[PDB]
Amino acid sequence: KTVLDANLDPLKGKTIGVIGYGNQGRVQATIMRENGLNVIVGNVKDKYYELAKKEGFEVYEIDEAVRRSDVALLLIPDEVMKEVYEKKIAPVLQGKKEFVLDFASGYNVAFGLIRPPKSVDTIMVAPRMVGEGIMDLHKQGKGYPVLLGVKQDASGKAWDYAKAIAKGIGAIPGGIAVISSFEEEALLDLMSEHTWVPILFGAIKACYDIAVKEYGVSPEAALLEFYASGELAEIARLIAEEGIFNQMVHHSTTSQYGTLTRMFKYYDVVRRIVENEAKYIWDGSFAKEWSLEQQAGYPVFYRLWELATQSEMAKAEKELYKLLGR
Amino acid sequence: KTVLDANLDPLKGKTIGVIGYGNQGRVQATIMRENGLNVIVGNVKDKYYELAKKEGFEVYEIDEAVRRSDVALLLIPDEVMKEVYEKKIAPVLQGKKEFVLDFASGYNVAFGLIRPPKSVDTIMVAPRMVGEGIMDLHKQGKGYPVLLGVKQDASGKAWDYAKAIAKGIGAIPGGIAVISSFEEEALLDLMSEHTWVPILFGAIKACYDIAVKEYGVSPEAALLEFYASGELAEIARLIAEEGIFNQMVHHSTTSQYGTLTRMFKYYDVVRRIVENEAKYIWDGSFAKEWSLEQQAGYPVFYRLWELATQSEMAKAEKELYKLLGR
Amino acid sequence: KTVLDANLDPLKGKTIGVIGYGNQGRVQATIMRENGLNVIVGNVKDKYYELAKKEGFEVYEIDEAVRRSDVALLLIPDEVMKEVYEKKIAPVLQGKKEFVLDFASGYNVAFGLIRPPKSVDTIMVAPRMVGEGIMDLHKQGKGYPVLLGVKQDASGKAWDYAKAIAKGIGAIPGGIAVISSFEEEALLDLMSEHTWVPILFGAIKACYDIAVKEYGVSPEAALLEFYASGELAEIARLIAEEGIFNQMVHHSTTSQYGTLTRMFKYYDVVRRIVENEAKYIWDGSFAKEWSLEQQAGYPVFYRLWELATQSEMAKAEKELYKLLGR
Amino acid sequence: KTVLDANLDPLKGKTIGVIGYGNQGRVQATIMRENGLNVIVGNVKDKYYELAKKEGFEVYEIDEAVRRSDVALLLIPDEVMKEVYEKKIAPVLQGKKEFVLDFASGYNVAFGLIRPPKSVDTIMVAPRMVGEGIMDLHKQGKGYPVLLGVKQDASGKAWDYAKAIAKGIGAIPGGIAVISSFEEEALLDLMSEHTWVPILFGAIKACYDIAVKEYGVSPEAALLEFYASGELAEIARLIAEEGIFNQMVHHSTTSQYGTLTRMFKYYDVVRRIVENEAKYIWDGSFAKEWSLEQQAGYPVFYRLWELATQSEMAKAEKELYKLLGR
Ligand SMILES: [Mg+2]
Numbered sequence A, B, C, D: 001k002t003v004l005d006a007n008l009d010p011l012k013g014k015t016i017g018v019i020g021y022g023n024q025g026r027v028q029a030t031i032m033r034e035n036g037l038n039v040i041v042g043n044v045k046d047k048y049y050e051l052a053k054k055e056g057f058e059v060y061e062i063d064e065a066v067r068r069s070d071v072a073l074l075l076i077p078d079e080v081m082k083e084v085y086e087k088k089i090a091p092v093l094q095g096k097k098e099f100v101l102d103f104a105s106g107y108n109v110a111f112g113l114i115r116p117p118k119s120v121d122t123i124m125v126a127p128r129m130v131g132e133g134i135m136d137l138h139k140q141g142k143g144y145p146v147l148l149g150v151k152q153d154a155s156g157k158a159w160d161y162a163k164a165i166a167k168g169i170g171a172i173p174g175g176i177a178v179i180s181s182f183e184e185e186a187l188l189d190l191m192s193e194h195t196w197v198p199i200l201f202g203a204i205k206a207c208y209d210i211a212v213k214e215y216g217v218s219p220e221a222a223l224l225e226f227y228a229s230g231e232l233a234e235i236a237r238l239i240a241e242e243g244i245f246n247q248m249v250h251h252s253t254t255s256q257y258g259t260l261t262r263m264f265k266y267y268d269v270v271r272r273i274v275e276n277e278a279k280y281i282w283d284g285s286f287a288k289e290w291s292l293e294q295q296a297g298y299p300v301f302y303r304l305w306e307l308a309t310q311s312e313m314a315k316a317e318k319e320l321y322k323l324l325g326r
């Protein structure tokens, strides 16, 4: 139920606009120039203004490139986007007869922090890669999977454009493209950062605090078996090629037994962590308190860095990295 | 312990100001002109500026009409009021020797979002009607009940003015006027919207989700017995004339039994919903998080509309209304 | 999955019987006479015997009209029906070769208090209206939705008759007709009276008892904001035309926020009230204790009227209605 | 707030009717004859018909004496009363222009098992005595306290009659008369039999079952210290003259200490027994299941006699009473 190839002639001929030359602009713009598209980099004058000029692009101010644009691509970070949509693009969108605007981030649109007008058809292309492996896969030849999705279709030409950009940026063919929504992309981007990542760090921290403080393990020997040596980077490489359970036939017989007997044991415990976290994002509740942490000036984001950089596990790895040569 | 008639000569002679020509300005201003009062409509130039000019009123800017005013009436909505009191009226209140200012909304004043000075005696007139039945009752002859209330009396002439406006707008005689506070009007306006309205919609939604998903009722037949036919509008008309329990002698004998045996049964369950909701508003807690939802940009107000307009009950009534001719 | 028109010739030609000239007999009989049907009113000699004679009908005793009937319609109340089916119709149903009998009330049949024989095909027509709006909609031209349903089909001609009466009484065309069962009509008639009606009265009663007894609101001011003024009749009229949530765009922004944040909050609390009430009726448990309250002589129905007519909220609205002129 | 004397001329001159010559008819009728009142005993022909004839009264059938009556007194038991009101008095009450009817039992009227018409003014006189001490106090000279109470006053002459009968039966002067309701007399008659009487028997039974079955007391020695000797009849005589706590100064110092330290200790435990029993009667719930026990044929009243007459405490006192000579 995915799409694999399409027509490039919808976005061809016209001049696509690119906003920001950041971590996607150094990546996605050069591929779109290679497919025969007039791309114009929008960026206010900073350090990133230079590299866009240095690598052969015509570059202008942010609100001026969307004037000369026909297809808009908005590749800027998520926490600065709401005020630059409102102070730069919001005065000029009232002159567009037909317009398409493209976000790589469902967080600002799905929770209604950015509401585009009727005439501006908003869509989404969300790359599933590091970003630092795109140009390698652009060099090698294959693609990379992306999520597509429409929010407002006031012309009927949404999927004429929604697949043509995924053809344009070199995602397909070679990779796939999954039709989805704006709301599902915002959920999977956030629930992966709220359910299985902070559980994982809190479990590696809790295995340090149990073994050192009770069982008398040396503080240098605990880190070498938890993350300071590479088993985490070894338990992660095999999932990308063989599967999640299918890499476990490269282990000892004992290691598969104690894993499988506990993975089905603690599943009901960790389901209630996840299912309470998913409704928390689905209500728009998390988008509110991340919007209030920015207005308060990050007092809770600041203290939790000092409680995490002065942890005993975070102190112990500091001297250990001045011992491995790192 | 209510008041029924008073003297009009306190607000007579001077020129009363009217701020905003909205849902009260199209209503309350024409009645005050009929009682022999110099009323002057304050409204910034918009669509509502036209109808105030179109129906024979002298109209000016918002902060300019309170200059020429002697008695101020502030009939503008509640969420825009704090910044237009602070940017338009707050520069000019420092020129008033004697002044009375009148709010139809206790929410902005009782929680201290609007603090008027000493010399400006603030009072309240709160109409108890639809608003769309005023001019009918103005046509017929009777009145409509209102809530009165003083907050700051720095002259002694508060109830000389607090009853004269209720005499002026045609509330009394014909209706009554209840002396109250600013804090009690803010409580009854909000606890009716927080206790028995969202319980009622959540109970009609829960009867759909029980009958369809379990007992195999047709999705078109469930709505015709819950709200799509008129029993709710039939169970509501008889309370306005006969009483809350006194309309139940127009029902079957079985319908009174199953109601009364359950109304006294679930009373202790729904008391704890109400009594926890009333202290939540009495602490000023709700006024805080409604003030933070506006600054965050309504992310939780936005998501809960999409969860309520994509409900299965809200989808099922859409096709049903393209079936009754509605 | 509803039916909109059918054939009238099944019930045409023969003489349909009508039992009782009550709240449906003054309504449903005159429409059936207008469609070219020989209707004969059955009623024992009382006050309702007169108006059936007064408005041009041939009228007889109850058990005698079903002798001359070919199609039976039984429009009598629910609490008297079991003994008049058993003492008047039960001697004479043993002479019918072919017969159809029609109840407007699923409560007596679905719980097995009335068990008709094999040869008597029992069906249901259940009007979804006030009853006092039928003749207006008969005057205007449109119809009104009804529930259909068969219980015993011992001829194959059930839906030949089950739609012909809905065509006969003027329900369709103009309204719809939903095919259902006897058991589903008894459930939706009773669970609306047991779940969201007695919760609603118990919540308006609990908002009086919280505001007056604790927060010091005046007892005359509490009723004017809960039901004595018309917002309940204003919050009910807009649901009949626009929808349940679609009428909330006629409100203030604050009123939609505090409603939607609490309607999704108390939904899990009020689901357990409903889902325990629906299995209580589905077991036939409620039909038992309403049958025992009648045999005990209503001692619990009597006391709960005195506890509800001597409530402080029910006392306070009495003097208030001698103050509005009501 | 009690009444002590009144006028006898309201019930004087006319002929008062007396229904039943039972435990009150052998008592209350002879006193009313002594005050100069035409009393006529109504009783169907049984054993009690004889003693009413034997002691000089004119006696008739039950429904015939209320024909010749002007003031009705209904001194018959409570479980037979509903069907003899309905089959004997209910045909003849439709001939009375003015009538007063008097019950000595609030249980049948307060729960609505007997509903008299408009023209029949129903009142209550409830004697507070054994019944077997009336004629002694009639011999000695003093009176006995009674409860008065009106239910329906459709003439204004209720308390003209409600005190004249208490003057007539020799209650006042010498005793008092307390104005009350029908509902309060039914509550105090039943909650004394449901709260402190069955707790008391269940506590004397539980002290037998603890001492014999565990602590090895002889089964003949346990009864002599609980009820078979007279301390219960000794702890009861002193309350009637001195008070409930004021009789405790006739005891040992130790007996007052262990009583008072435990009476305030178990008060919160036995309050929840009482307060759940009082709402059970106030809802009319007990009147329902006593009405259903009669229709079922007393299966639960029958088994609980056999479980109480075959108790080990009830067996042990049988041989003990063939040992004291009782
Ligand atoms: Mg991600």
Ligand SMILES: [Mg+2]
Residues within 6 Å of the ligand: A252, A255
């Ligand atoms: Mg290993």
Ligand SMILES: [Mg+2]
Residues within 6 Å of the ligand: B189, B192, C231
């Ligand atoms: Mg309101």
Ligand SMILES: [Mg+2]
Residues within 6 Å of the ligand: B252, B255
């Ligand atoms: Mg009904």
Ligand SMILES: [Mg+2]
Residues within 6 Å of the ligand: B231, C189, C192
């Ligand atoms: Mg109904």
Ligand SMILES: [Mg+2]
Residues within 6 Å of the ligand: C252, C255
């Ligand atoms: Mg409102």
Ligand SMILES: [Mg+2]
Residues within 6 Å of the ligand: D189, D192
């Ligand atoms: Mg007693």
Ligand SMILES: [Mg+2]
Residues within 6 Å of the ligand: D252, D255
């Ligand atoms: Mg002693």
